[PDB]
Design a binder for this molecule. Structure first.
Ligand SMILES: [Mg+2]
Ligand SMILES: [Zn+2]
Length: 526
């Protein structure tokens, strides 16, 4: 039934599938951080047994150990103990609800009441996490910051990656360098390092801004990865890092960041696995639209833009009256949720001094506000409004101040990055189309469960074969991919990228690849 993690001798065999005895709290924490390295949701309840060293982590009072687990490992369905009937019932109920992917999504979104504070005292919901992070006292906030800093002090985060060899880290530099970003060949561990490469590089360009050591940046990125649901086929940490990487390339080609040795100038090239002796991006030697701190703000927003995404859509949350849709009055439901979580859970604790920075010395617009703006901008229900705000801007008669100009460019760039799958080279674009279809099919299955149009076996989980490397095998596994892509390019992408490239000439290559991909998809519609 449960995975049991123990700091003490006690055994609870009635509920135990597998038991891990840890010598230290630090080692227990490291075990928990590594859980999001996989491609699947944690689907068993976890029981942590506490007692009724120079290490400050290991010597924390129970109240602080408990606070650490509750806050940083909310995503792992943990029951902490230090009543056999209550325990067994609680764990059994949680197991029954966690085993199956469709059950899990229903739990998070509050749309399957009929099946199932936390559910069974163990499983977190979107509203629970949202409420917890909005209502936190200043004292609780500073205590979490203290515990965050303690982990940075005692945990060596690079050691929690599976392959941090010089060759691998160099390969990731060159991967980050390709417009054909091979996201599907990168593990969730590789992806953490990719984020480090991009954010460290951006931080180094900001004048009055202290550089942040490797370990501190890695801790932050582990925390971000932990807010993404690993079992989501599309809206997972890999998507976030992909969108960040798209933004990263846009910003380089706009001159907001300098090019680096590992940057591949030609965006139409496919990925080649290259390496050399460098393990970080090596910079080479009028103003760009976005300055260095605004560039960093855009990158940070792209990183957090889908935090906590439950694997559904605004349409689903609205039509099925999900609690979060009721809170947000059907307006930008998931995006409001992502913005609130990313600011109040992640950045307020991990990087509070970034939030209080302003976009320029003169301006009072904060990076907090800019990040919110950019995240909210990814709502496709508001697509037309930004397209028209671009047309009003381009028509120089109607002018914006500097603050609203920064907001608009930032909004357009993150929008383009978020829907950039059709602008990647064909093979990579197709791989994304496949995983996007998997998530679409899961949403259809969840709707059928709620409508009582299908009876699923909730004792088994959804599993997927590896995404194929070659376009050929992708098209045989699901032909008709082409019609999703034509629909999306015609009705959304072509117009946005054309319109954005008209304003920002350097991104024209995106329009070039959309057309090339469109022609191919048209060719097999025939
Ligand atoms: Mg989104
Ligand atoms: Zn997204």
């Amino acid at each position: 039934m449960a995975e049991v993690l123990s700091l003490v001798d006690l055994e609870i065999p009635q509920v135990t599938d597998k038991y891990y005895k840890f010598d230290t709290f630090k080692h227990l924490i490291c075990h928990l951080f590594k859980k999001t390295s996989t491609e699947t949701d944690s689907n068993v309840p976890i029981v942590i047994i506490f007692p009724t060293n120079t290490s400050k982590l290991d010597n924390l009072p129970f109240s602080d150990k408990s606070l650490l687990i509750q806050f940083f490992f909310t995503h792992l369905n943990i029951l902490m103990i230090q009543d056999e009937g209550k325990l067994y019932q609680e764990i059994s109920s949680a197991k029954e609800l966690l085993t199956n992917r469709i059950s899990r999504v229903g739990n998070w979104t509050g749309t399957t009441h009929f099946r199932y504070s936390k559910i069974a005292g163990i499983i977190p919901t979107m509203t629970y996490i949202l409420n917890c992070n909005a209502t936190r006292s200043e004292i609780a906030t500073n205590q979490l910051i203290y515990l965050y800093r303690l982990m940075i002090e005692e945990i060596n985060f690079i050691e929690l990656l599976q392959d941090a060899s010089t060759t691998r880290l160099s390969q990731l530099c060159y991967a980050v360098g390709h417009w054909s970003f091979p996201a599907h060949n990168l593990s969730n561990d590789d992806l953490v390092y990719c984020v480090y490469l991009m954010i460290d590089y951006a931080i180094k360009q900001v004048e009055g801004f202290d550089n942040i050591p490797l370990n501190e940046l890695l801790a932050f990125i582990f925390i971000v990865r932990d807010t993404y649901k690993n079992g989501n086929p599309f809206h997972n940490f890999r998507h976030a890092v992909d969108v960040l990487q798209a933004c990263f390339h846009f910003l380089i080609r706009l001159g907001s960041l300098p090019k680096f040795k590992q940057f591949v100038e030609d965006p139409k090239l496919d990925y080649t696995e290259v390496h050399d002796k460098h393990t970080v991006l090596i910079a080479l030697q009028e103003k760009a639209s976005l300055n260095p701190i605004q560039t960093l703000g855009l990158l940070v927003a792209a990183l957090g833009h889908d935090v906590g995404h439950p694997g559904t859509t605004n349409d689903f949350m609205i039509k099925f009256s999900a609690p979060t849709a009721l809170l947000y009055n059907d307006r930008s439901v998931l995006e409001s949720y992502h913005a609130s979580l990313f600011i109040n859970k992640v950045l307020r604790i991990c990087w509070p001094d970034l939030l209080t920075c302003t976009i320029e010395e003169k301006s009072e617009l904060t990076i907090r506000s800019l990040i919110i703006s950019s995240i909210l901008a990814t709502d496709m229900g508001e697509h037309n409004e930004y397209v028209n705000r671009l047309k009003s801007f381009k028509t120089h008669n109607e002018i914006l101040n500097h603050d609203n100009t920064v907001k608009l460019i930032s909004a357009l760039l993150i929008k383009c990055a978020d829907i950039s799958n059709v602008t990647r080279p064909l093979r990579v674009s197709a791989q994304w189309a496949m995983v996007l279809s998997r998530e679409f099919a899961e949403v259809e299955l969840l709707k059928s469960v709620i409508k009582k149009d299908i009876d699923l076996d909730f004792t088994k989980d959804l599993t997927y074969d590896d995404v194929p490397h070659e376009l050929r095998e992708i098209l045989e596994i699901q032909p008709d991919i082409h019609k999703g892509q034509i629909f999306f390019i015609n009705l959304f992408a072509e117009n946005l990228f054309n319109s954005v490239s008209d304003l920002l000439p350097q991104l024209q290559y995106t329009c070039d690849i959309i057309m090339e991909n469109k022609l191919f998809w048209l060719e097999r519609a025939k």
